[PDB]
Ligand binder design. Structure first.
Ligand SMILES: [K+]
Ligand SMILES: [K+]
Ligand SMILES: [K+]
Ligand SMILES: [Mg+2]
Ligand SMILES: [Mg+2]
Ligand SMILES: [Mg+2]
Ligand SMILES: [Mg+2]
Ligand SMILES: [Mg+2]
Ligand SMILES: [Mg+2]
Ligand SMILES: [Mg+2]
Ligand SMILES: [Mg+2]
Ligand SMILES: [Mg+2]
Ligand SMILES: [Mg+2]
Ligand SMILES: [Mg+2]
Ligand SMILES: [Mg+2]
Ligand SMILES: [Mg+2]
Ligand SMILES: [Mg+2]
Ligand SMILES: [Mg+2]
Ligand SMILES: [Mg+2]
Ligand SMILES: [Mg+2]
Ligand SMILES: [Mg+2]
Ligand SMILES: [Mg+2]
Ligand SMILES: [Mg+2]
Ligand SMILES: [Mg+2]
Ligand SMILES: [Mg+2]
Ligand SMILES: [Mg+2]
Ligand SMILES: [Mg+2]
Ligand SMILES: [Mg+2]
Ligand SMILES: [Mg+2]
Ligand SMILES: [Mg+2]
Ligand SMILES: [Mg+2]
Ligand SMILES: [Mg+2]
Ligand SMILES: [Mg+2]
Ligand SMILES: [Mg+2]
Ligand SMILES: [Mg+2]
Ligand SMILES: [Mg+2]
Ligand SMILES: [Mg+2]
Ligand SMILES: [Mg+2]
Ligand SMILES: [Mg+2]
Ligand code: NA
Ligand code: NA
Ligand code: NA
Ligand code: NA
Ligand code: NA
Lengths: 101, 118, 50
RNA sequence: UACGUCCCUCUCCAAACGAGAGAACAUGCAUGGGCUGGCAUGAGCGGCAUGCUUUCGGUGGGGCUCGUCCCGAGGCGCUGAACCUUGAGGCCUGAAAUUUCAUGCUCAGGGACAC
RNA sequence: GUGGUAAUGCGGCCAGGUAACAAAUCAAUCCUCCCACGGUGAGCUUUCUUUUCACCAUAAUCCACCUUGGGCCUUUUUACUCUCGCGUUGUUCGGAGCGGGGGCUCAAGAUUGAAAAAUGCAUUGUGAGUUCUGCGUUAAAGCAAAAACCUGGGGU
RNA sequence: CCAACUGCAGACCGUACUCAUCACCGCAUCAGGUCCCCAAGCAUAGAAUGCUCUGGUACAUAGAGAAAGGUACACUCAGGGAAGUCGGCAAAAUAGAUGCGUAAGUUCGCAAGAAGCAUUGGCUCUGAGGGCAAAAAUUGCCAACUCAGAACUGCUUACGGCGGGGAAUCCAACUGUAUAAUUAAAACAUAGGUUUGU
RNA sequence: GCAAAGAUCUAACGGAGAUAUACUCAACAUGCAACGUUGGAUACUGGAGCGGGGAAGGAUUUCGUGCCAACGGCACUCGUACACGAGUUGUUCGGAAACUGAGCACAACGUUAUAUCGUUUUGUUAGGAAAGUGAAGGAACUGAAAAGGGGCAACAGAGAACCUGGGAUUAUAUUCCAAAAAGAAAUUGCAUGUGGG
RNA sequence: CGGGGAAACCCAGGUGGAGGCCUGUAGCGAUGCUGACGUGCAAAUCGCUCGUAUGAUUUGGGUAUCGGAGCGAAAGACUCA
């Protein structure tokens, strides 16, 4: 009992990677009976095959750190690795200021 | 952004308010109560206590009003609240009661919610 | 790749058509000396280079 | 024939593997507890209060709301606390102790030689 | 054929043009990422968490017609009289016509609508990247050509 | 006459798959070689490097497991500090950013990151640097991050990544090139100089 | 010796691949080790990717079912293996019809005992007469002017009228979809009408 | 553009981005370990280290010049191990 064909067809139909396709470990005869794209679509409609949600990559830590940085943290002398011109080019500052004036 | 934020300012947060208030959010509990509850009073008490206004739990004033009419629940407020927030509060409630594994909640329409089953 | 002259495609087609085993009834015949095609070709063993 | 020996099994003064030292229902093994030691005061909560300690004593540069209650690195208290402590393999169930160990697993050992 | 003072608008042969061209700078189109707000679904929920994650799409081809930049016309042209003015981040520019007013035109985009919701999946604003495009220094180095196509000059 | 419809008709060949730690070349499913496009989040100067959502993968013979002796894109070491060695080979060392400071020599360009000295965390704040609109030197709204300066409070000096430095002598001016598979150099080239033929 | 590229674990299912036994024997001490799939866990690649598409090269390795003799330096129930049966759809995509480039060299001429040699784009072959038809004029027959023959060489230069949706495959797709073409276009070549000033 | 200067000119600060310029990716190479390996992964590879990285730079395709010969920034290098 190999469900490689059904998994391949389900990944094609659902528009997702193999890791997000869920094939019911129970109900294996019903999935194995599905040899066409139409029958795999029927399996997806019956809940036998499910697209799983993507994993979480959360930006909450970065948002909190961005609030801290906006208040003025983490940007002192010990923190900066690039040259001052790299961090804030002198040409950009000059262009800004002359356009202002 | 325009003005630099402060940590002390984070102490007390002020919630934006709209123009013509009395904005209404409704939860519809008809289906779960149709089944075999004294749980509508539970939900109303939960929303009276654990609902946050200006960053504080409770003390809603005239701004947020909760009523339970005809086996459903209406929420009327003059603050800029998101519907997803009262959905979040409902999901917390159902996580307390252990119903969340059984009661689901969906947008039945614009401005209202509905408790359904699986 | 995608490109090939039709003549090269026809030569490759003929080579595909030739890459078949011997029918068994050929082995049942009266003076038969053939049992394997002996000119079978695998794409990984030997190249045609058309 | 009988004594017995080896393998399986268990321990580690032995050890590349053989070999060795041992044990053979044995506090033997396991898990706890205590000791001995290592690190350095856990999570949680809290600020003259139903908290901490035994009548005492109890923050913070600043900041934000409406005297109060909030945000705030760090600090203080409960708290020499929390965790780790035999395992390639520390101690105690056999001196005494303000405590000085407790439990539970084993239920005809199996196999081959001796023959 | 025809209108506008004009810039220019509208219904054999010959000579030009497109094709057609190294670089940098600074703005940048789509597009990508982020943030704000608002919907839809999902996740966490011992305790916190107005939360975390996902999604919120609009192809070619057409019609109409609110900015940026370039070229130009016309008009004022005592514009540069002894510190001329305009403009770029930047190396400039002007009686061989600057600047102002009013227009013509080209190139990029906007906006309106047709397509188009009948489709798709289960939203409308900002900040960073990004060379389509716009802005038409090394050189004893100056950075292909042709077909095809376009327009005129003459003639019917 | 021909400028908008409309009617009919639009022929040929290619098209699977692969493009590589298994599809090509290297006798092979070989740690070698092989052109092009699209290219996400956080740290950060970043296509460095480290980790991660989407996509992809768990394929490379494995199990048990402290001998000696090895190999390592693995470490440490009291006291001394090159005494080792042909030779500091190897390893150690230096390190980012910012301010200050910097000799001889010199073709005036450099030498130079010369040498050296110092500072950088975390929190809570303060200042400066703008755009839009109706003595406008003011009145509202608003966005993006940087730089500076304080108080308080820490350090076990603590990811990655990241120059050691100086005094002289020989040679070649310099950047280049070059013995594919033992030689990268002082060799070749070079600009510059001279000569010859015409 | 099969040690670079970190790595697998767990259950259930499938499978001949097992829980496979002389007496005694309850099970350990007498069937070990290994598989493919799904679910879950853990990790890696880390966008200069064991991602998604192309050229060269390869040519069926693609897809489905089946099968494990040999091959996949261990293993296999698995396979780029083997057997059977399939699969590549175009007015517009790429090429060619139909451009020029570095270049090539048919003709021509010359040379050579020998063409199997040379010249052949510095506007251009050859001592070199290399043009074969717009017109007219009474339906195909006749003919002006025009200098320098015929080709080839780019699948990244020039050139080139299509693009979204699909519940549309086992495998192809800007190629397939059928009158509500899901549909919306653009563009050739001929013909038919409407209208013209 | 600011300051000096009788004049010639001098002293500052900004702008701008030159270079067979430097550090450093990819790329292109290959210094040392005289490391690994040396019946190899490999009839030249692997690791770390190292040179260069806007140029006399690297690279695809096409095209031209060869055996008493071609080509060569010259090593008798290279011309399908
Ligand atoms: K070969
Ligand atoms: K070990
Ligand atoms: K160590
Ligand atoms: Mg500058
Ligand atoms: Mg071929
Ligand atoms: Mg042992
Ligand atoms: Mg005792
Ligand atoms: Mg294809
Ligand atoms: Mg590829
Ligand atoms: Mg990176
Ligand atoms: Mg990288
Ligand atoms: Mg492998
Ligand atoms: Mg191996
Ligand atoms: Mg030492
Ligand atoms: Mg020491
Ligand atoms: Mg010595
Ligand atoms: Mg000595
Ligand atoms: Mg060294
Ligand atoms: Mg000096
Ligand atoms: Mg020096
Ligand atoms: Mg220094
Ligand atoms: Mg030299
Ligand atoms: Mg030399
Ligand atoms: Mg010299
Ligand atoms: Mg150089
Ligand atoms: Mg050099
Ligand atoms: Mg050599
Ligand atoms: Mg020389
Ligand atoms: Mg062996
Ligand atoms: Mg990973
Ligand atoms: Mg890749
Ligand atoms: Mg094998
Ligand atoms: Mg086959
Ligand atoms: Mg030519
Ligand atoms: Mg051609
Ligand atoms: Mg085409
Ligand atoms: Mg350089
Ligand atoms: Mg060596
Ligand atoms: Mg020599
Ligand atoms: Na290819
Ligand atoms: Na390989
Ligand atoms: Na091994
Ligand atoms: Na076949
Ligand atoms: Na540096």
């Amino acid at each position: 009992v190999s469900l490689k064909l059904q998994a391949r067809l389900a990944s094609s139909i659902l528009g997702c990677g193999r890791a997000r396709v869920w094939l019911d470990p129970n109900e294996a005869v019903e999935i194995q009976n599905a040899n066409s794209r139409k029958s795999v679509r029927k399996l997806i409609k019956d809940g036998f095959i499910i697209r799983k949600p993507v994993k979480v990559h959360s930006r909450a830590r970065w948002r909190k750190m961005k609030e801290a940085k906006d208040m003025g943290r983490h940007n002192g002398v010990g923190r900066r690795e690039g040259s001052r011109e790299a961090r804030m080019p002198s040409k950009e500052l000059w262009m800004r200021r002359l356009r202002i004036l | 952004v325009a003005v630099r934020a402060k940590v002390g300012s984070r102490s007390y947060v002020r919630q934006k308010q709209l123009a013509k208030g009395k904005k209404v959010f409704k939860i519809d509990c008809s289906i779960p109560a149709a089944d075999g509850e004294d749980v509508l009073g539970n939900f109303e008490q939960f929303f009276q206590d654990n609902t946050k206004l200006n960053g504080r739990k409770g003390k809603l004033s005239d701004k947020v009003r909760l009523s339970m009419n005809d086996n459903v629940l209406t929420i009327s407020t003059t603050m800029a609240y998101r519907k997803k927030y009262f959905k979040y509060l409902t999901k917390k409630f159902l996580k307390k009661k252990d119903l969340r594994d059984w009661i689901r909640i969906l947008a039945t329409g614009k401005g209202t919610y509905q408790l359904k089953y699986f | 790749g995608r490109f090939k002259p039709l003549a090269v495609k026809k030569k490759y087609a003929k080579k595909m058509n030739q890459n078949k085993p011997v029918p068994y009834w050929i082995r049942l015949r009266t003076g038969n000396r053939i049992k394997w095609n002996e000119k079978r070709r695998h794409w990984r063993r030997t190249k045609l280079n058309y």
